[PDB]
Design a protein around this ligand. Sequence first.
Ligand SMILES: [Br-]
Ligand SMILES: [Br-]
Ligand SMILES: [Br-]
Ligand SMILES: [Br-]
Ligand SMILES: [Br-]
Ligand SMILES: [Br-]
Ligand code: NA
Length: 129
Amino acid sequence: KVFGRCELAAAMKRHGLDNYRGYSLGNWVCAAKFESNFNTQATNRNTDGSTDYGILQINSRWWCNDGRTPGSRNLCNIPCSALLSSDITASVNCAKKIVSDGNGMNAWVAWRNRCKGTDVQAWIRGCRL
Ligand SMILES: [Br-]
Ligand SMILES: [Br-]
Ligand SMILES: [Br-]
Ligand SMILES: [Br-]
Ligand SMILES: [Br-]
Ligand SMILES: [Br-]
Ligand code: NA
């Protein structure tokens, strides 16, 4: 599914991400935007062999099992394919583990480089929430 911007904000808020670990909803929408362009089926291979999955581009080195990343963990305890569902529940639950792990939203290099410190509320402006 490719979400629209306010549809995704609403989905994110419904699943408890708005102010999760202190991160206001516009930060989660901005991170989505640049990690996957709001498409639940996004995938990208990293140089190391791992792969990043879904709207928040969650990586198989630590978080999900995709059967082909040697040495990796699956600390979300889910198949990476779960992360590509039109229903974002598995992406969100795994993102709340990731942002709790120590470095907050810096675990998402696109949110540090493209969202951190910017007027992230522009990503939810206008939306009914
Ligand atoms: Br947009
Ligand atoms: Br594996
Ligand atoms: Br699995
Ligand atoms: Br959903
Ligand atoms: Br933090
Ligand atoms: Br915001
Ligand atoms: Na893994």
